[PDB]
Each structure stands twice: as C-alpha cells, then as structure tokens.
Amino acid sequence: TIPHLAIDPFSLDFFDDPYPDQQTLRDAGPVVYLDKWNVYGVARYAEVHAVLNDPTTFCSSRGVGLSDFKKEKPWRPPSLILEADPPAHTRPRAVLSKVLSPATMKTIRDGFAAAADAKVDELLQRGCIDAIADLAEAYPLSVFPDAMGLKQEGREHLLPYAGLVFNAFGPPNELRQTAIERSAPHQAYVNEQCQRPNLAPGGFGACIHAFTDTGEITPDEAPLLVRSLLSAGLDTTVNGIGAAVYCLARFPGELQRLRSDPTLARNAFEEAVRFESPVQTFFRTTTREVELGGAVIGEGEKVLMFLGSANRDPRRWSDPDLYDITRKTSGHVGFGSGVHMCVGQLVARLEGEVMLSALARKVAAIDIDGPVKRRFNNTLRGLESLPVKLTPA
C-alpha cells in the first residue's frame, strides 16, 4: 500500500538540489517508506503538520534523529526539551519560554539593532564581501554569544559544536561519522560554559540558572538547558539570515519592495525561513500503531518529517517556489509546530528583522559576484560562501 522509494534525503546529491526529489516524495503518496534507512517519510504539509501536532503518538523522547534511543545510546545526554515528551518536557520548556520571552526581547533589541546597522555600514566600506562569513556568520557571532553571557575565549568552538549537533540527527553516514570523530574539544568547551559561574550576569545563561529556585527546574537541569541554547540558537540563525540575503540577492524585485517599505523586514525574514527552511528535517518515533494518511504504521517506527518540503507543498501554498515578502506566512513549519515549536523563535526573528531593516535602509543592490558554494549538513540547509557586491543606497 505504501510506496517504497530509494531516495536518500541525506545524500550530497539531494542536498545540492532537493526540490525535484521532494516533489517526488510528495507526489508518491501522503506516506512513503524510505528503503535506504528503513523509516517512514511524510513530505506534504498536511501530514507533516499532523505529525508535529500529535506528540503523544509521534514522540520525541526516543530521539528526533534517525537513532532510536530505545535501541542505541544517544551520542550525548538527551536534551531536556528537544528530546523530551510531555509531561517531562513541560516545565523546562516554560523556563526557556520565560528566558526568551516577549518581555525579554525588549532588553536586547536596541543592541541587536545597533550591531546590525554597524555591520552593514562596515560591509558597505568593503563593497565586495562574502555574505556568509562576513554577514550571516559575523552578525550572530557579534550578538548571540554576548547575549548568552559567554566569555570571549573559545567562541570559535560554537559553530563547529552546533554543526556537529545538527549532523548527529542524521543517519550514520560519513557526514555524521566525521562530525562525531572531531567532537571531543567542542563538547568539552560547551559543557564547561554551561556551569553557572561561567555565564555573565543578565544574559540568557544566568537567567536559566536563576529559574532553579522557582520549582520549575532544579540546579542540575540548568546546564543542559544552557546547552540547548548553545546548540540550537546560533547556527540556525546563521542559516536563516544567510537564506534571507540569498533570497534578496536572487529576487531583486523583492529587495526593491523591501527598500520601499522597511516595515516588511520581519515578514521578509519569515518568508526566507519558509522558502529555504534552514532546518530541513526532523524525526519522530511512533508510540503505538497509527493510521496516517491511509497508511498503517506500527509501533516503534521512525517517521521523517520534511519541513522544507511541507513549506513548498502546492497543496498548501500558492506559488510555493516564489519568494514573496508580503506572503501570508503564518502556518509554515520552518520553526516546527505545536508543543516543541521553536522556543527561540522570538530571538531568531529579532536578529533577522533588524538585519533586513539595516539592509532595507542602507543598501540599493545585492549582486552575486562570485561562485556560490553550498554547505552540507544532515539537518541544516545553507551556503558556505555567497560572494556579493553591496551597492550603497
């Protein structure tokens, strides 16, 4: 009943151009079986959304990568939030909600915006830049480690550690094997910065530890929740901002609309998250036999959700392959959906908005002027190098 496909969604060929194979996955049926990895797949918006919003049946505590924690040891202690189900998920999630809360964004917005403006001014002095290293990476590195409260020394470990984490959700291919091989120094640095004395007053890390006397988390839970922010909160924004700049470079008509109304900055970033979907995929594990889109899936089965494909599904979106900064983007799954929906989405949107605002006010044109190089990761989609010429307004 279920179609079986040989597509490997973690192969370099797939990463290089995933869109034809994603249509093949959507059009084969609402539920597919991927023979390469012995998992079920859902690539249409409807089934991805249904799976995300039934965490009882499609759980996260057996891992959101290919590995089933019931069968194999996790490569690092499980995340207390990403790799937990309700009710154990609920109180740590509430603490991160409050640490990254609507009210908290007010304390950081002025500094994030000034750093975004300063970066664009600096880049305009050079003219020809790499929008990945010099913008998408440089800007979050200039604000997020400080907002965490990290010391200066050792920050070079942060992007390698996060790349490792996201590669580790994948199957045991060479990308994953090599990441884990190189992991020991980055793991050591990150685990050490998660301890209370190493997190500067007023930053996100200190605020997590401060919640350990409310009864929502205990002191021994705080370091792993800091670990969540250091795993999840930097590389994702790098690829989100990189996606937005790549979109503006490829769709100059949309840059022109953004210049004419810079208040579109927040939605231009949200549309870039839909359009590129920096986090491409996550798994769930079934806790019972279940009917999904007509198919019967047994207990204990891994289900691969194609978030990027769901965000391009023509059953849900008009002209899904167009970048449209006034699109009604509500309901895209680039941040997930439901109880695990990205707890840092307000930080991500703040960074994206203020960077696109700086570009909207200061730049007249963004022209690719060198070879574009893709970066390969089992979970993240983004570029390694994006040479652009920035023309000043």
| Contacted by 335, from Cl ion, ligand OW4, ligand HEM, none: CB < 5 to 8 Å by type | ligand HEM
Q: Is 136 in the site for ligand HEM (CB under 6 A)?
A: no
Shortest Å distance, C-beta 221 to Cl ion: 16
CA distance 83 to 73: 13
284 annotated binding-site participant: yes
Question: Which of 82, 138, 244, 359 is close enough to bind ligand HEM by CB under 6 A?
Answer: 82
209 annotated binding-site participant: no
**Span near ligand HEM by CB under 6 A; candidates 102-110, 257-265, 272-280, 381-389:** 272-280
Question: Which of 282, 306, 317, 323 is close enough to bind ligand HEM by CB under 6 A?
Answer: 282
Q: Is 217 in the site for ligand OW4 (CB under 6 A)?
A: no
Q: Give 282's contacts (C-beta < 8 A, 6+ positions apart).
A: 64, 169, 305, 307, 336, 379
Q: Is 232 in the site for ligand OW4 (CB under 6 A)?
A: yes
Q: Is 167 in the site for ligand OW4 (CB under 6 A)?
A: no
Shortest Å distance, C-beta 127 to ligand HEM: 27
CA distance 62 to 284: 8
Burial of 23 (0-12, 13-18, 19+ CB in 10 A): middle
Asked if the bond preceding 87 is cis, omega within 30° of 0, the reply is yes
Q: Is 82 in the site for ligand OW4 (CB under 6 A)?
A: yes
For Cl ion, the nearest residue by Cβ is 76
| Contacted by 187, from ligand OW4, Cl ion, ligand HEM, none: CB < 5 to 8 Å by type | Cl ion
Q: Which is nearer to ligand HEM, 5 or 231 (CB)?
A: 231
For ligand HEM, the nearest residue by Cβ is 344
Q: Concatenated DSSP letters for 175-202?
A: HHHHHHHT-HHHHHHHHHHTSGGGS-TT
The alpha carbon of residue 321 and the mean position of all alpha carbons in its chain are separated, in whole angstroms, by 20
> Residue for token digits 């690719």?
368
Q: Which is it for strands 32-34 and 4-5: parallel, antiparallel or unpaired?
A: parallel
